[PDB]
Design a protein around this ligand. Sequence first.
Ligand SMILES: [Ca+2]
Ligand SMILES: [Ca+2]
Ligand SMILES: [Ca+2]
Ligand SMILES: [Ca+2]
Lengths: 87, 87
Amino acid sequence: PLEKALDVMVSTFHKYSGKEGDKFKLNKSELKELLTRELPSFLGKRTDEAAFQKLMSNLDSNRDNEVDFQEYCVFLSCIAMMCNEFF
Amino acid sequence: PLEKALDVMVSTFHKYSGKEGDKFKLNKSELKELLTRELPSFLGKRTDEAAFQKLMSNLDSNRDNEVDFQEYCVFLSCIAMMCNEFF
Ligand SMILES: [Ca+2]
Ligand SMILES: [Ca+2]
Ligand SMILES: [Ca+2]
Ligand SMILES: [Ca+2]
């Protein structure tokens, strides 16, 4: 179960970062699709365009306006750490 | 199912962490069964005690001789990224 889940995390990235432009990174449209479709829970209601834009600015540690796989990775793990702490 | 993939990530850990001493930490021995029954395709056959110490040394970033939930998400991000760079 831990192995199908880790490649569920891997294949999901590529599910959107390749739709447009750099096929190795998520741009905003791409990031919104992923979250909106694959991660609605950890979504709540902040569905503005203003919620997503700092939603993209905070995942984007490099500041290169895109989320690479690494970065998606630190995001998934913050979300893991956050839930854990809850249960 | 990404959100499904996070669920089991967080639970797989506690399924093993709550056996001995700290219940929110993995000691070399709980890590052992986690790694062996969960991530079998990552541990080939170097499973002696040096490939299992190594790992512990590897995993345990604060060096309290135990794997906590954050050091376990760092490790997991290392597996996914490995799976990723190979595509
Ligand atoms: Ca892209
Ligand atoms: Ca970036
Ligand atoms: Ca323990
Ligand atoms: Ca530790």
